[PDB]
Structures are given as C-alpha cells and as structure tokens.
Amino acid sequence: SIPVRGAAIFNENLSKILLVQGTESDSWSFPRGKISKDENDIDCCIREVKEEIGFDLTDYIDDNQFIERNIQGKNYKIFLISGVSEVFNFKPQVRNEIDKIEWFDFKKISKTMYKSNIKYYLINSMMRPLSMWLRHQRQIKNED
Ligand SMILES: [Mg+2]
C-alpha cells in the first residue's frame, strides 16, 4: 500500500475543480500517483500531476495546504491549489492512462453527489474539508 499524492485544483474564481478520468475506470478523481521511492510528498505530487495533466504545480503548491485520508489501506495526501487558468491546454504526458480532463462546477457536484449518473472517487469522502477550505479562501481575501 504505497502512499499516493495528488492535487485538488481550483480555477481563478474558485468555482470549478479540475478532475481526471482514467482509461480503465469511469470514476472522476484528482490527478495523482504513487510515491516513487526516494522522494518527498511535494515532488511526488508535482511529478504525477504534470504527467497526468501537463501542468507544473511548482509555484502553486503549499506544503501546509492539503487533505490527508486513509482509504482502503492507502494513505492519500491531496494538496489544495487555487488560481489555475481554465483555458490552459491540459493534456497528459504519459500514454494510455488519462482518458478525460474536465472542469467541474464544484457547487453542482456537492448538490448532485450521490444523485447523478456520474461516478467519483476520493472527492466524495473529502467534500466537507474541501468546501471549508473554499470558505476560508473567501474569508482571507481582504488580507492580500
Ligand atoms: Mg503516475
């Protein structure tokens, strides 16, 4: 049960989240991947997200901003990212792994969770701290 690191990526106005669908499942989830030995959490996340969506998180990632969950034996650590351009040309840099990359209206997801024909993984067990984090992001706007 090697740990997995990935990112929850929100757009400029914090209304949409970027999710990926693999080629062997119809579930939507965060871009992510297994720790490749002799590497820390941040480098793993940067490498894996770049492989899966072609975007380099180096200047965006904050080692203090993450959600951690143990799920079916595996440790997942999902870093929280805001301000990413919606019109960036996302595309995978590895073969046969990622089928689709799409922005989702985060409010709609929360409203239609276990009610749509759409399957999710990880994000459904993280809805609360995610929306708490977004709330917090608005509360601090005047601090900048
Ligand atoms: Mg990978």
Swiss-Prot record:
It comes from the Eukaryota. Mn(2+) binds at residues 48, 52. Changing residue 41 to V: In DCP2-7; impairs mRNA decay at 37 degrees Celsius. Transmembrane segments: none annotated. Present with 8530 molecules/cell in log phase SD medium. Component of the decapping complex composed of DCP1 and DCP2. Interacts with mRNA, LSM2, LSM4 and LSM8. Interacts with EDC3. Catalytic component of the decapping complex necessary for the degradation of mRNAs, both in normal mRNA turnover and in nonsense-mediated mRNA decay. Removes the 7-methyl guanine cap structure from mRNA molecules, yielding a 5'-phosphorylated mRNA fragment and 7m-GDP. Decapping is the major pathway of mRNA degradation in yeast and occurs through deadenylation, decapping and subsequent 5' to 3' exonucleolytic decay of the transcript body. Blocks autophagy in nutrient-rich conditions by repressing the expression of ATG-related genes through degradation of their transcripts. This is m7GpppN-mRNA hydrolase. The lineage of its organism: Eukaryota, Fungi, Dikarya, Ascomycota, Saccharomycotina. The gene is DCP2. The chain holds residues 102 to 245 of 970 of the full protein.
